[PDB]
Amino acid sequence: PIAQIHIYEGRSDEQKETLIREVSEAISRSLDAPLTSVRVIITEYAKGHAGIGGELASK
Amino acid sequence: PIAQIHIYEGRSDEQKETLIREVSEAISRSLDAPLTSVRVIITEYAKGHAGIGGELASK
Amino acid sequence: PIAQIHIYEGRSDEQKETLIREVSEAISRSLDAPLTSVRVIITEYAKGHAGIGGELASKV
Amino acid sequence: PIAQIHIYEGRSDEQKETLIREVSEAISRSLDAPLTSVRVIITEYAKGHAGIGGELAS
Amino acid sequence: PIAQIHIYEGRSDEQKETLIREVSEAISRSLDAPLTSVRVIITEYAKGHAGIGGELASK
Amino acid sequence: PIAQIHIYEGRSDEQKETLIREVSEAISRSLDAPLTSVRVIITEYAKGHAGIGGELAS
């Protein structure tokens, strides 16, 4: 499985490593898939590059 | 946060429901983000549409 | 520019055609990019394949 | 609805805000979906990271 | 490396297998990355779900 | 066709240009599709943003 996770910028490397580990484990146990087969990629966004209801996340 | 999870076809409804719940919870606790803000989209693939090392997953 | 638009299944052909046109026009005028350069791809999802708050969209 | 828009780098914050608003409104009226349900994420690319016909956009 | 390739529906199984192999090889030599590390996922689209210049690919 | 290629950061502009050209040509010959119709977008990732087996690539 391959998971792309889109998150706001601003977290530490440690928090992102935790995110990757916990998500990978959740995918593996949910699907009964080998942990080694799970790939995760994180993509960060500035709040000025994200919209909800047409309004910037930054407001 | 938004997670797009690419998985092989053939998982049960129950496993997919678990996937959505467990991944959402993992994202929420890892990022200290409200669970209600976490969105997940599952996309399924035939093994004939996936490659590893240039070879079909189906072989 | 390339837009990938993820929507729930169940829209009409007419609404999808409108979506493509109106989004393309919005991208073109917002960015001052030639309309001919704007590409849109629509991807549909069953509500059973979408989660909000850890719950299936088909439930909430 | 969730829209991911891939654009070249170099626009101002104001132009990108306009992009987000106008695209969101277009999605909402095209689909008769509540505006509040529409999410947009912008991803920028350097012209050396985009290819057309095998050739760099730059 | 992970490649997602978006193509129109209607290609043969053989062409898709070739696509996976040839793209994977191109990635491997371009990046000097081991072929075994390259993953490809193909996604097909109906021409009614693709727009060019605001017009459906199907017209 | 549109290809999105996710790669680790650290390659030169020249290597990325080669990637774009060689991938585009591979798509074109594999599908018998005109080279001019093939678009490629590259996205780079830090090794701290990539997981294999739940562990950081770095």
GROMACS .gro file of C-alpha atoms in nm, chain C residues 1-8 11 14-16 18-20 22-23 26-27 30-32, chain D residues 1-8 11 15-16 18-20 22-23 26-27 29-32:
model
   44
  119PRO     CA    1  -0.172   2.380  -1.494
  120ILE     CA    2  -0.328   2.045  -1.394
  121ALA     CA    3  -0.624   2.006  -1.162
  122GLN     CA    4  -0.724   1.671  -1.012
  123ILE     CA    5  -1.076   1.693  -0.870
  124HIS     CA    6  -1.193   1.416  -0.635
  125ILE     CA    7  -1.574   1.397  -0.610
  126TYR     CA    8  -1.838   1.155  -0.487
  129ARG     CA    9  -2.304   1.346  -1.069
  132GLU     CA   10  -2.376   1.760  -1.771
  133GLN     CA   11  -2.256   1.863  -1.426
  134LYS     CA   12  -1.915   1.708  -1.488
  136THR     CA   13  -1.973   2.216  -1.641
  137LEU     CA   14  -1.718   2.140  -1.369
  138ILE     CA   15  -1.444   2.094  -1.621
  140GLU     CA   16  -1.584   2.639  -1.505
  141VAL     CA   17  -1.277   2.516  -1.317
  144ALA     CA   18  -1.124   2.995  -1.309
  145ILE     CA   19  -0.767   2.863  -1.326
  148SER     CA   20  -0.670   3.352  -1.175
  149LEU     CA   21  -0.321   3.271  -1.301
  150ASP     CA   22  -0.328   3.458  -1.631
  179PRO     CA   23  -1.502   1.772  -0.316
  180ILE     CA   24  -1.120   1.796  -0.296
  181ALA     CA   25  -0.918   1.963  -0.569
  182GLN     CA   26  -0.539   1.942  -0.602
  183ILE     CA   27  -0.409   2.212  -0.838
  184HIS     CA   28  -0.056   2.184  -0.977
  185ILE     CA   29   0.079   2.521  -1.095
  186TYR     CA   30   0.411   2.681  -1.182
  189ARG     CA   31   0.257   3.379  -0.833
  193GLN     CA   32  -0.312   3.553  -0.684
  194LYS     CA   33  -0.309   3.213  -0.517
  196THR     CA   34  -0.788   3.432  -0.580
  197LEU     CA   35  -0.721   3.095  -0.746
  198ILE     CA   36  -0.847   2.910  -0.439
  200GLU     CA   37  -1.255   3.116  -0.782
  201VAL     CA   38  -1.190   2.742  -0.820
  204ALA     CA   39  -1.664   2.701  -0.974
  205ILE     CA   40  -1.674   2.356  -0.812
  207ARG     CA   41  -2.183   2.592  -0.868
  208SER     CA   42  -2.092   2.320  -1.120
  209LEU     CA   43  -2.183   2.038  -0.884
  210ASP     CA   44  -2.453   2.214  -0.683
   0.00000   0.00000   0.00000
